[PDB]
Amino acid sequence: MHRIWLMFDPRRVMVAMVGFLAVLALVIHFILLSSQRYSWIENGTLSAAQAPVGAS
């Protein structure tokens, strides 16, 4: 359990984890912004019934 920190130092793992989480969060937020259904800056105030849906 805790012995993973005797193998990976806490400082390096924390910096990599923070960096990966920030990049992932920005990528997902930007992917949603580019979509029609989840461009919340633009549609945003539309109800779930009014929101765009992809073609069947």
Binding site: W40, I41, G44, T45
Partner: protein
């Protein structure tokens, strides 16, 4: 460095962080009244 100065610094850092969050909360509430995004 010393824990005496590690206690002084953490007090201002938390209060500065708290002050920054609160003014951002006020700013977001102002923008919501003007033009809500949901």
């Amino acid at each position: 460095m010393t824990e005496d100065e590690a206690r002084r610094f953490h007090g201002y850092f938390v209060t500065g962080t708290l002050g920054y969050i609160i003014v951002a909360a006020v700013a977001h509430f102002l923008a919501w009244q003007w033009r809500p995004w949901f």
